């Protein structure tokens, strides 16, 4: 959407239509300083748990990383605002 959020960018552009890869290495026991957590001398009809972002949990957002600007493997498209209503703190 040309007139939506990011209209400023669209106007500036002037477009007007409208073995180290082994799974264990990445397990967070081998990548997290969990020692810091140890506490020493410290001093359901509706969901009980919260619902996670399905796009973060499931989608391949990694496909929106632009590795090479000139050699971009696919063609990206303008993104429309989707106003997810799962999030609270949004009136609608």
């Amino acid at each position: 959407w040309r007139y939506g959020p990011a209209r400023l960018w669209y106007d500036m552009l002037g477009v007007p239509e409208d073995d180290l890869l082994a799974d264990e290495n990445f397990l967070m026991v081998t990548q997290l300083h969990w020692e810091d957590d140890i506490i020493w001398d410290g001093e359901p009809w509706y969901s009980i748990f919260p619902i996670d972002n399905e796009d973060l949990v499931y989608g391949r957002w990694e496909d929106n990383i632009i590795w090479d600007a000139q050699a971009m493997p696919r063609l990206l498209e303008p993104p429309v605002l989707t106003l997810d209503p799962n999030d609270e703190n949004l009136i609608l």
Binding site: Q31, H33, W61
Partner: protein, 403 residues
């Protein structure tokens, strides 16, 4: 298409009404091509009384006029008002259909209500067309959106971070970081930031990318708004600021290097605050950084970004990701101490990669080695990482003295 006849199994049934026990199949074929031949000769001669006596209906008095024509005896009882009823009999293996005729008391036909008397044939004249079209006599056929307050706030805050002056930018970032009610404007800010980082590919502006990364860093410091629902948009924008190769307009003089370590610190914060075992944010970020680093053909800028993010994640990550590929430093020093082309742009990026690598691997060498470190540099690759490790041990001793 083909000559259609009565079925041959319909003549075995008829032959058992007669009393003939066994009739062979060549006799049944001999019967059914004759009786279906005589049906077609009375089907087509009944049609000659349907056409010459103009009827287009083929009443049962047409067949009786044709059986009279072929000399065969008439079929009695087919002029009464009847229809086609059939009654199925299932049985214990014998499937058939019959009539199921009914009875009626004789005095209820003597005392039936008589139908009305018929009328005699008379003539009637009427105009069908009068010099043209037909007359109309009855003997003829008939013929979600932001309120203006927050729209103005969104406009002023986004245009304050495009680069007219620095003081309005600092007040806009201190607004974003410290306001309580900026929800309902978080999706607009996420869209603005992600599309603005995308617009770097058309115009390789380092400055506007630094401004958008300071916008993300200000969005993270807000205590009131929760970026959990919108982090899937801000993660690849910061990732694009890390591992893309042309971050500059003039590659040689622009310090894309700082937008590298700033965005690497940003993504370490974004996967410290938000990584949950349902999310798998940190493991999926380490996997992208790792397969971008281990894979050859990658430019020195994107390798710098990969090493910078991996080294800002923490100590155990550089233990189990960076330290196996320390021999890659030799492949780097292949193109530094001895390059056929010196005046290219690979040398500044290579020794930037080298400086970052030995700066981050000096405390890792200080953690997992002896305290002496006499010829660890010689044992290390190129003998320089080891000098940096000795310097790091000296710095740690100085920090202990300060404590």
């Amino acid at each position: 298409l083909s000559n259609t006849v009565l079925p041959s199994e319909s003549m075995k049934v008829v032959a058992e009404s007669m009393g003939i026990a066994q009739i062979q199949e060549e006799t049944c074929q001999l019967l059914t091509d004759e009786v279906s031949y005589r049906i077609k000769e009375i089907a087509q001669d009944a049609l000659k009384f349907m056409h010459m006596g103009k009827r287009q209906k083929l009443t049962t008095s047409d067949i009786d006029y044709a059986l009279k024509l072929k000399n065969v005896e008439p079929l009695y009882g087919f002029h009464a008002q009847e229809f086609i009823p059939f009654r199925f009999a299932s049985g214990g293996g014998r499937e058939l259909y019959f009539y199921e005729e009914k009875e009626v008391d004789l005095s209820d036909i003597i005392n039936t209500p008589l139908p009305r008397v018929p009328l005699d044939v008379c003539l009637k004249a009427h105009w069908l067309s009068i010099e043209g079209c037909q007359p109309a006599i009855p003997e003829n056929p008939p013929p979600h959106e932001l309120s203006v307050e927050q729209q103005l706030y969104y406009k002023e805050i986004t245009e304050a971070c495009v680069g007219s002056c620095e003081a309005k930018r600092a007040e806009a970032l201190q607004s974003i970081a410290t306001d309580p009610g900026l929800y309902q404007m978080l999706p607009r800010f996420s869209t603005f930031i992600s599309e603005g980082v995308r617009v770097n590919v058309v115009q390789n502006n380092l400055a506007l990318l630094i401004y958008l990364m300071r916008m993300v860093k200000a969005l993270m410091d807000n205590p009131t708004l929760y970026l959990e629902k919108y982090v899937h948009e801000l993660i690849p924008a910061v990732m694009t600021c890390i591992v893309s190769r042309q971050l500059c307009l003039r590659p040689d003089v622009d310090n894309h290097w700082a937008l590298r370590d700033f965005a690497a610190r940003l993504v370490a914060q974004i996967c410290k605050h938000f990584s949950t075992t349902t999310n798998n944010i940190q493991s999926r970020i380490t996997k992208t950084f790792t397969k971008s680093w281990v894979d050859e053909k990658t430019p020195w800028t994107t390798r710098y970004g990969s090493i910078a993010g991996l080294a800002e994640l923490g100590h155990d990550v550089i233990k189990t990701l960076i330290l196996p590929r320390l021999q890659q430093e030799g492949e780097r020093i292949r193109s530094v101490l001895d390059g056929p082309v010196l005046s290219n742009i690979d040398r500044i990026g290579a020794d930037h990669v080298q400086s970052l690598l030995l700066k981050h691997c000096a405390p890792v060498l200080a953690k997992l080695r002896p305290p002496p470190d006499n010829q660890d540099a010689y044992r290390a690759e190129f003998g320089s990482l080891g000098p940096l490790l000795c310097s790091q041990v000296v710095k740690a001793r100085a920090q202990a003295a300060l404590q």
